[PDB]
Design a protein around this nucleic acid. Structure first.
Ligand SMILES: [Zn+2]
Length: 199
DNA sequence: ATTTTCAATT
């Protein structure tokens, strides 16, 4: 019987975790998956605060027989929970540290959703590159086949993510000078991977 | 500014 918090619900995302994950570093397990879907209303997009949430990419427990690693798969089961209707247009954008994924099994479930649900727009923000050995070339093309929407988080996205996921009074967001260099380095690699199709 | 990367098992 603990009294409810006055500052607000513990559903707030700590600023240290957001900065640590987005600290702009290569290699980071236990990544975090943030998602936010809104409903179009007569041309007016009304997002729902309750819909905004995040999932953990760390799920272990063979006792339940549950298999999965990337939180993206967990969110896949959340899609059917919302029961989105095809007659309406919904914009679901997922923000994760890495946009690329291996063909463990989640890359196939997401591809089926886009193929079965073409009336839905999926946009993923690539904060980091999780590729791998050279075989990663087909992996990116395999996911890009249905997810032809990959963009690197920009300075505005980082600031919007802080106030969108983090809301602490008296704690302002402090941008770091690394988006320009990281965006340019990742942008060259991101387009370079797709440029292979052009040739 | 930080250049080898999604903590599932046999
Ligand atoms: Zn995956």
């Amino acid at each position: 019987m603990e009294a409810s918090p006055a500052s607000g619900p513990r559903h707030l995302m700590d600023p240290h975790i957001f900065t640590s994950n987005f600290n702009n570093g290569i290699g980071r397990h236990k990544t975090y998956l943030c998602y936010e879907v809104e409903r179009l209303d007569n041309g007016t997009s009304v997002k729902m605060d309750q819909h905004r949430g995040f999932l953990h990419n760390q799920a272990k427990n063979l006792n339940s027989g549950f298999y999965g690693r990337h939180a993206q798969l967990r969110f896949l089961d959340l899609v059917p929970s919302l029961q989105l209707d095809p007659a309406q247009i919904y914009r679901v954008t997922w923000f994760i540290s890495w946009s690329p994924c291996f063909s463990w099994g989640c890359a196939g479930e997401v591809r089926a959703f886009l193929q079965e649900n073409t009336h839905v727009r999926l946009r993923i923000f690539a904060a980091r590159i999780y590729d791998y050995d050279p075989l990663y070339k087909e992996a990116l093309q395999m996911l890009r086949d249905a997810g032809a929407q990959v963009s690197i988080m920009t300075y505005d996205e980082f600031k919007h993510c802080w106030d969108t996921f983090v809301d602490h009074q008296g704690q302002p967001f402090q941008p770091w000078d690394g988006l320009d260099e990281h965006s340019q380095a990742l942008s060259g690699r991101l387009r370079a991977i797709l440029q292979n199709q052009g040739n």
